[PDB]
Amino acid sequence: APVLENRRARHDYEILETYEAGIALKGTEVKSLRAGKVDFTGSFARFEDGELYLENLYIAPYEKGSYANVDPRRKRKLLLHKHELRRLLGKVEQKGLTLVPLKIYFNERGYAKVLLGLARGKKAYEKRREDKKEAVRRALEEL
RNA sequence: GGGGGUGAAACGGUCUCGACGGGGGUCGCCGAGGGCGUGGCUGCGCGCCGAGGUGCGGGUGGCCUCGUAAAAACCCGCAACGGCAUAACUGCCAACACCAACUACGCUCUCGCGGCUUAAUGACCGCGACCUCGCCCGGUAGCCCUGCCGGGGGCUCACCGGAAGCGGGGACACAAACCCGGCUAGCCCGGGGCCACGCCCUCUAACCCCGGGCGAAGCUUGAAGGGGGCUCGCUCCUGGCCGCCCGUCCGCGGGCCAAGCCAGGAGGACACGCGAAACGCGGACUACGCGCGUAGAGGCCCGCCGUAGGGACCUUCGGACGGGGGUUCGACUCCCCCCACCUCCACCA
């Protein structure tokens, strides 16, 4: 369906700030999300950058047999002017509240976008002893 | 085996709200103290020799060219530089140290009886020692209080000793081999007077200090002065020397002074100064030597905004429907047409 979502932050983690970005991609992914595939892969980013390069994300290839696609979890440009794209960047390197795809989707005109945020929900902070039990019961179920 | 469903949530209005990459602006980064001279000064300039570099340069012999000409080298560096990146740790496998129960501890440092400190048990303390040390009194040797008034402070186990008082043991680690407290160093022999409006003989000082004497030998008082003994002119300052010629070199000329002498005067010292004159009109600047013309890395102005060049950035404009060509804003669709993988079709050798 042309609006779906990525639940890897909605029972697992969830957001502290939300943003969205258009993502150019080579047409070979379009029918698969428009029909009904979704993703849950761990996106990351690396970002001493002018824009904000996302690392990893499946829209899925469209398929019958082999088709003409190339792996979707490659780098993609992210639409938004540099200054407020630096607002999405503003906390991305804090290693604890971290970049997540929230909802892959298309706009009304059929071009692809991703709702994005920065999130946590397992533990108050990692690498502590105390709150790891809440990261394996609770933060794989609730939020 | 081929033809075609189809790889899009819109017949076209399909301008992902917003990326990039060319613009519109910039103009700071950006081969640069935002400049450069195709130009000028001082009676027409300027020297008496000297410049240059390999890719980018530190260094280095004046290699060498060689004056109508400021024209062609090199050892070594730059080469060297050990650059990773989120949101879920609790798993695999590992460990920790002194004493008097007893042999010195209260026992220094060779012996002998009691005590009783864990039984320190004849070494401590109350005491019995040859031989040495100490207190306390006496002597050769040591005495640099060398005045009197109260007391000649007064003697050292050094060299010898327990006698007039006495004690430990092989070390009880000394103070006197020079001392306290009062009168001007008294009592008294004796040296001597200098420096600050120059000093002292006279003076604020019985003239005096006090180095010093009797158990053994020689420098001052002064805060102020008329005259004298000392090194003095009381003490200093009035005119000849000297310092200087004004863009680089000078034609034509030549006086005075900050200040000591030789030598006269003036105030109370050497506490701080009484008016004749050092430059001025010009003679050149290779146009009077070797030379020529912008000499060849002096010193300041005058004239061209030196280009906005040399660069890279924002927003903003141009966008990914499997690719690939039409094209009124895109266009597997409206149309030509390439590949996946399926769906429909005329066949045995």
From Swiss-Prot:
How it assembles, according to the record, is: Binds tmRNA. Binds to both the 50S and 30S ribosomal subunits via rRNA contacts, bridges tmRNA binding to stalled ribosomes.
Keywords attached to this entry: Cytoplasm, RNA-binding, rRNA-binding
Listed Gene3D superfamilies: 2.40.280.10
Report the sequence similarity comment from the record.
Answer: Belongs to the SmpB family.
Subcellular location per UniProt equals: Cytoplasm
This protein's gene is called smpB
What molecular function terms (GO) are annotated for this protein?
rRNA binding
Q: Which domain of life is it from?
A: Bacteria
What task does this protein carry out? Answer: Required for rescue of stalled ribosomes mediated by trans-translation. Binds to tmRNA (also known as SsrA and 10Sa), required for stable association of tmRNA with ribosomes, probably by bridging tmRNA to 50S subunit. tmRNA and SmpB together mimic tRNA shape, replacing the anticodon stem-loop with SmpB. tmRNA is encoded by the ssrA gene; the 2 termini fold to resemble tRNA(Ala) and it encodes a 'tag peptide', a short internal open reading frame. During trans-translation Ala-aminoacylated tmRNA acts like a tRNA, entering the A-site of stalled ribosomes, displacing the stalled mRNA.
Note from the entry: Athough the Valle et al., electron microscopy paper indicates this protein came from T.thermophilus, its sequence maps to A.aeolicus. The Fu et al., paper maps the coordinates of T.thermophilus to E.coli.
Q: What is the lineage of its organism?
A: Bacteria, Thermotogati, Deinococcota, Deinococci, Thermales
Q: What's a Pfam family in this record? A: SmpB
Q: Which SUPFAM superfamilies match?
A: Small protein B (SmpB)
**Classification via PANTHER family:** SSRA-BINDING PROTEIN, TMRNA-BINDING COMPONENT OF TRANS-TRANSLATION TAGGING COMPLEX
Q: Which GO terms describe its biological process?
A: trans-translation
What protein name does the entry list? Answer: SsrA-binding protein
Which cellular component terms (GO) are annotated to the entry?
cytosol
